[model samples]
Target chain A: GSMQPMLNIALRAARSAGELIFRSIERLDVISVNEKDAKDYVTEVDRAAEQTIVAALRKAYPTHAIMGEEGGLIEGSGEGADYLWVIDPLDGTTNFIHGVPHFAVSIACKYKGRLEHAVVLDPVRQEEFTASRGRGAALNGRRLRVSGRKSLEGALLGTGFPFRDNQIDNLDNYLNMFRSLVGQTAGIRRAGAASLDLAYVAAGRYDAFWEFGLSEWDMAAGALLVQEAGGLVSDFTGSHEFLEKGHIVAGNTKCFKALLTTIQPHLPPSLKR
Target chain B: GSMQPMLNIALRAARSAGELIFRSIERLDVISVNEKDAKDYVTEVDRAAEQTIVAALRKAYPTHAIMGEEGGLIEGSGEGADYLWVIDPLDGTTNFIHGVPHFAVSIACKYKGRLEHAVVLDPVRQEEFTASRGRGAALNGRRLRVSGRKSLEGALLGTGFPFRDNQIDNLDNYLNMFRSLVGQTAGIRRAGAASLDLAYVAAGRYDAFWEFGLSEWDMAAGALLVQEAGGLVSDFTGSHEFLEKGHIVAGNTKCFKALLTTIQPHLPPSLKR
Candidate 1:
């Protein structure tokens, strides 16, 4: 479709940002310290990558709105602007800091509050996953699609832990859902990268993925990728407000409802409150 | 030291096996029906890699005891023989079958019941880790050592879930330990490859790792890597009997002890009996 030109430009921008992030990783002098307690960490690589991506996007798409993980925001002219780019220059900061080769560079374009194009690049593996609304998805030029599996009983799911520091505050709920899913699903994985988690869902590497407390930059590109690859995406409560709500559940349609049902009882009262 | 030559051989063997595994991964024809069940996996890759490794080692050290995951043992002269090799041609078989990238080739050598040399090779990353009894460990020739962090409060641990479908019947003990460790440790990761898990411990990426129901092929190389990198290695009961017991807990000294204490109360009745 006519989306090809924009997708090509987006892919290059995302890959350029990804290469910068990968270079920064090799030179990292990790200074690990407690981040809001112990489970979280932010590295110099994260900041440096974000700065590089923001500068590149600014020069390439000066008229577009920009929202990134580190830098704040650059509002576009109006809601009807041609493009708004959302970027998480480095999606799996924890894995990167720990020397685990499972992080990514996420970039997506929204046209009038609706995602139109996306790219998630895992530089370590040299895997580049790209997608556009109504254009399908691909990894390194190979076509990709959501798994054809129609049942939850044997589906493989991916997820990540909450960013909030205290497990006690959320333990009961997490355990309840974990226990329920363990009995019903074939397997569950927590790979610690929200963007890659969604891309895997798009590629059918994982049948579903859910996570809470994500930023708009983390999910924007990935959501479009999943939807474009014949999967469904929504906030945990089954609404299209994931960007603002920051709680997402995504999978092929048949399995999405089953996942929601499995997770429903354990949702905290605060989520509804 | 004289152990250097054997260490070199082990490294080469592991890398050769790893390359074979990598080639097999590239040829995987993933069938959707096979993906339906967690245990629904079988591939010629496993057998091919095992044969490649076994044949190479037999040519090099024909008289040494060879205990491999896919092939049965070939006993040496006696228990006090100068050398014995333990090999797992492909670690993380489930991940390999599912096309997930977390498998490795692990090889280790022992002299008179004491680990003397070891190597772990990650096929995806092409990373080769090696160690000798008295000489230090190294990752791709860069020296390796355990993290200096001494407390459990901020430590990240790795583990494998039990594989037997029905063995999870007595999983309360695992759940108790998992819940307790969740709040106490910085994070718990299940990357699906035990050899890489221990390599992470050796490289200071992860502070600890533990698993039950592993075979000698799974832990031999990794345990020695941890020990040579200045971490502790032992059975869950805090003894140097892991090979015979098939249970393992390894980390820097402080983290190892903390893990042991956390799991003590949840010990299964079989462990007590």
Candidate 2:
């Protein structure tokens, strides 16, 4: 109830951005064959979607600060604005470029540096994940919850690889963690889309999710979704600073702790936080 | 055109089985929380789907042998029958149980042990992948081709983790292969469904694919789809014994060879073949 209006705007903004991404799907064929063209075309689509989202949000909340994946932070007209809108016009850009039909548009509204409203929209599936603080989360108006899995045994988990050039060296640590968990769990899925992966955790499709080197825009909305869905979200060291640290783990109460415990021995100095 | 009728039967069988699996989707909520119940319910659904498929095939070709994941092998009435059918009524059973919307129904017809007609159907999305020997692969009637990526660079690869108890020990070698390939490709996706992963390769959603410890039903239809889509499928050591050996790679000619070369140094004794 605190920010239902903000959540509504976020949904509209996310939906508009997702629509843009969906309309450009057919163009992937022409560009996908050429690596350079594919990357460039996806960048264009990303920026265009960001623009569409920003225009909508700006019109609705002109005095709110906005941060986007393609376009960086823009402090609103007022100094020390209490609200910030973070957006990733298209998460899973690689999947989009490859025509994998799995990507999402993420939007979040933060007040006083705390998540207040969130939305993650899957264009192809037309599934909308929405949450407002203190009001719980939902998928297409259906109430959502973290999976009831009490332990890693028979649990299905989701994760992403550290693919950025700067983070690629951490692959060994990721593998170590994977090696440990793969043996104990039912399965692990790397679906190439962080926002949707997090949303799936909220929808109970995945018992938990962890990732490295995420941007603020990539996880801001999704983190809130998990939290609102009666799950926990934290950094590698079990701190609330995940949005800043970019290494995040999320799950139900039991899994959140188990994941952190499982990840402890595998973490190198850089990822220890 | 030799077995067009058989392919039509496969298409109908796959569609009917997929419909049954989709209808059971709602039951997952009741059983998913209890690990044992979830497994049992999935087993029941799987067996039921297989029964439906087998009944259809038996009605159409009573003298043809049929092999199913659940039902095992049933020799036809004729001792020297030249044809056999391989079917996985539901692939991605884990995903289905978890309420993830990505799994398929796969069916393949073989004549004298050669893949003759194939069909892989995605129930939720209604996307059907079909192929006939010497004819070509199609996704919902649109001709399919593997991506034009000539090398691993900028390629999106699909893979499955070895999660079964017996094969879990091979995690080390699998990790080595993954480590080698993760850096060179655009990205790697593990979507938890072998048939859908192979079908994605055929549809060019994934540039390449590889997996270990798959049953015949898991790869039969999708493998044929890839071969008919102008891609190569092989075992780890670059041989055409993937079906027998249970380790397979699929990609365009260039990526397939590149994968084999990349995987050469990582193979242990058991994986070498």
Candidate 3:
């Protein structure tokens, strides 16, 4: 409950940043682009969005630490400061650059190493998903909950493919998971937006979501949203330390465990390497 | 040039249907469901949306032959009617039934066994894609064209998996196309909407799209949209008779040929069976 003010601040900051990003998309000439990899790209829109968000947070909570995708980390003012914000100014950068309409602004607050509050704003869809540690999740004022499906046979799942430059060792595992889920689940979808993927799970549109090679900012807000919607959230190995590990699997109670068991045998050995 | 009036009519009809579908989605009781197959799903919302679309089309084009997903074929005035309309009132019904925001309304007109005009409307995004044979395509008021990327190495393709229980034999070919494209393309997306898949191809969001086991209602409009957008539309063997064959592979000239060459060697024998 102590994080309520911070949650309100985050929602405002995120919405402000989201509106600016939406406007910037219409006038992309001002943004400079750089290739993070052959197919991966980033732009000034990302940095500007991050700057807007961080500036708003700093104005309200100056002593708090901030870890952002574009701005990196800022240490807290005091030793063992109890709060920090993790942010991804723009989660679906690839889609954004291509003028495709699937992306979001994600923000999360951590207190004493535990995620306490989270927000994910999808500008294209005008959907704002938010959550608190003990409170349920909501989308634009409507309460959210995960699916009730107990089996993979009729469940819809969400996932993202590894980028072209990623290590090939884990591909076999992904293929194995794909093979197992093909005939069983309703289908698999790749929307190019991590925060939206989690929001979909929270809204019961998708029964489960799992992906690897993500960053803290990508999963921070989304993971909290899933758990707050009465779903389970964990790392690939079903551990609670997903923030540090950057691997996530989230779903309702029954489907979550089933997914974990289904992927256990196929986890790549390179995960340790 | 003769298809211009039909194209305008279809564009208006599809956009109207899309608006109705979007409004209906907000009032849907998603808890109600019906079983179709392993991956196929239908709901009352689907039926209502289809009925709304069919009624609108019937009122406008009283003399035209109508072929729709929910409502069966309606014979036109004459035996060899010059024009017929094909519609999938709500493409991506599975996504719609689950409250996902990726479905669309698709309409096409056929003249003397050839698709002449097409429209694919996304009400959520407020995008209307229209095309007439030999007239090129447009999204909103701006002209549309397929991607200029010439090689499969950097191309993004879209596809859908076949799920019909009776057409189980088609799965092998689907898998073959999936495998062949995965290694060659920059990425492949399965967005679950065949009409939108083709619309993305026309808008250059996707470099190409290919799928089999589709119906005339699904391919009639989409095929012409691709062709009008400076792209090629063909069956698996590079023929123009896609509506009858219920198969399609569409992309810009270079990417289309490249994709065809890659898939040719991996053609499954079951395609002919």
Candidate 4:
């Protein structure tokens, strides 16, 4: 089935919410920041954006299941619709709060639990990344492919830190990986946004990306973007069951195996298991 | 005593060069990327942008000494003109080559060996961060003051990997500091542009930032931005000689002391002197 309707609505919802988040940048001080968890800072913008997306999607696809960062799931899977719309209103909350200007609105629709359509919109720069199953991903209407360097020696990979609790159990493992990576690769960027990082992998801006402790809303659209753009998405051991545990390692065929080999031994016990 | 004339020119140069870099993003495949070193890559855009800045600055101040990332010291410091211009036509060359828009055009002026005026322009976002000695720092003309985040624990810090195999004392020690920091802070960002990273510190986008093995062009404009914004900039052992050494640790007064203390132990054995 053509994904015209699904892609259209997701783009509409994403752009609608992205504009709101963009306008909130400099006025961050005026918003009330709440401590959702140890290091998770939420603001009215997140909830409002979530509402806009949920509303827009539900208005068009009344029975579509909705899973969101702020509201969990607005419509359950048993509600007679197999299309599940997942949304992350603002992906890089910390960067946004600090006025760093690198964040996005990500929306994905899954058909019978298989990713079908995806969109990650950077409102600040007006970069809209979209994907449809079997169709190549596109950025601003142009086709996108995983860009790469042939050598693992001079590759640039992206990653993220586990910020919840402001604590991570396997600090040594992270450092071990970070140490070897920086020495081997051109650099390892922790841009503070999982969704955009994945989108970056899709656009060939990043050679690879590996991170853990993310939720469904974070990986759904981005992982599909990577795959649709001809890259691989897997867990620490190169398994596809990353949706549950959220330990994602993604890259192009050019460097996926080499990148994984370097990252495997440095994984924490849970991810290794 | 007024730096009005110098600051205006610096801004003009930065924004002009930045626009050129921004337009060349997707055309990276068309540009020739040359290996500056083991992991360092320079491109035609770097040289082109440098020429743009050189042309603009030389037009306004023909007698000024100049040091640039691509073309070093267009005019000698001893040429009877005490005013020296330092520019990184495009800082974060790797990021630029990879299509990451976080890089910037950095311009700084030194008068009689003393830092005088600075400008860091982000072309992608059209963000202009400017500063003049004894004058307040600004982002788009809005005065910047480093946020008063009181502690280092759970604080956001920024850093970079030493890609210049030219010479970094020990990769092992840098990893030690990075490991400790990941466990200690809310997050650590490696956005890949030292100039913008410093500007983020000035605007309180980051609680503190530390990196070494950079050239003066990478830190000159940024260091001044932090200082004029009422922040502290020093080397590992609490010294102000970072400009020449390219080692920097900067933050607002609230987190400056504690941040430096945490980074001091991880300094390279040679840098400890």
Error of 4 at A202 (Å): 0.5
All-Cα superposition RMSD per candidate: 2.9, 2.6, 3.1, 2.7
Clashes of each: 0, 0, 0, 1
Choose 1 or 3, whichever is better by lDDT: 3
For candidate 4, the docking band is medium
lDDT by residue (A122-156, candidate 2, tens digit) is 98888899999989999988889999889987788
**For residues B1-273, could you state the per-residue lDDT of candidate 2 as single tens digits?**
233777989999999999988888744443333233322234577877899999999898889898888778888766537788999888988888888888999999888899999999998778899999999998888788998888999889999998877876688999999998877798999988899899989988998898988879899999999999999999988887898889999998799889888888888889884
Poorest lDDT segment (10 consecutive residues) of candidate 1 chain A: A31-40
User: Which residue ranges in model 4 land beyond 4 Å of their true spot?
Assistant: A1-3, A29-41, A76-80, A165-167, A268-273, B1-3, B26-28, B76-80, B166-169
The better-scoring model by lDDT among 2 and 4 is 2
Worst 10 residues of 1 chain B by lDDT: B33-42
TM-score of chain B of each: 0.91, 0.93, 0.88, 0.94
lDDT of 4 by residue, B1-273 (tens): 334987998888888888788778845453588887777678898998999998998888888898998888766435538888889999888888788878889999998888899999999889999999999898888888887777876678888876656544567777777776665577788999999999999988888998878789999999999999999999878888888877888998967888788878777667775
Arrange candidates by lDDT, descending. 2, 4, 3, 1
Each model's lDDT comes to: 0.77, 0.87, 0.79, 0.83
Which lDDT tens digits does candidate 1 get at residues A1-273?
344866777787777777877776666566543353356566666666777776776676677888877667778665325688888888877677667778898888888788988989998888898988888888787677787767777667887765356547776577567666765566677777888889888877778888777789889989988998889998878889988888889988788778877788889875543
Rank order by DockQ, top first? 4, 2, 3, 1
